[PDB]
Unconditional design. Structure first.
Ligand code: CA
Ligand code: CA
Ligand code: SR
Ligand code: ZN
Ligand code: ZN
Lengths: 8, 164
């Protein structure tokens, strides 16, 4: 695999 | 790795169904339902797709809040870091959107991460979009809160290359 969304 | 997806990575029907399998306790259930509806509404305005909530795993897009290892071999990492992940359109696990339940989920101005903004991003993938290198695009890989309209040209350009 999935695409991931990352925080600062 | 060696895993491959099936298909061309876009939907080939216009009524996309979704199933909210569970909830973060951080917001009322209806507020979460609306946050997902609002995220879907961003994309339905600029595509020929409709998004219909269903109530079984028959759905194109299955939505799950998970902690750590939550069933797909791609574990979440606890507070902060990875916030969510999503699989491109197709059968089975494809299309699905998962959110890290170890996060504090908020809406705008809340002290946690915006469920609305994160869902809008994840759903972008669940429709077929890749990450953008445009820092202000919704599909940029890093979360930055904002109150301005989420979609940018690069996002609409990506989505239209998929659906017209
Ligand atoms: Ca996390
Ligand atoms: Ca939480
Ligand atoms: Sr699916
Ligand atoms: Zn992403
Ligand atoms: Zn997952």
């Amino acid at each position: 695999x999935p695409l991931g969304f990352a925080a600062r | 790795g060696f895993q491959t997806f099936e298909g061309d990575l876009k939907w080939h029907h216009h009524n996309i169904t979704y199933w909210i399998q569970n909830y973060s306790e951080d917001l009322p259930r209806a507020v979460i339902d609306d946050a997902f509806a609002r995220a879907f509404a961003l994309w339905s305005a600029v595509t020929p797709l409709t998004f219909t909530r269903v109530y079984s795993r028959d759905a194109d897009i299955v939505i799950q809040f998970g902690v750590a290892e939550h069933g797909d071999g791609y574990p979440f990492d606890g507070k902060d870091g990875l916030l969510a992940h999503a699989f491109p359109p197709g059968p089975g696990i494809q299309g699905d959107a998962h959110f890290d339940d170890d996060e504090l989920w908020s809406l705008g101005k809340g002290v946690g991460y915006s469920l609305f903004l994160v869902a809008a991003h994840a759903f972008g993938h669940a429709l077929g979009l890749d990450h953008s290198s445009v820092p202000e695009a919704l599909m940029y890989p890093m979360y930055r809160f904002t109150e301005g309209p989420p979609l940018h040209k690069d996002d609409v350009n990506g989505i239209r290359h998929l659906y017209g």
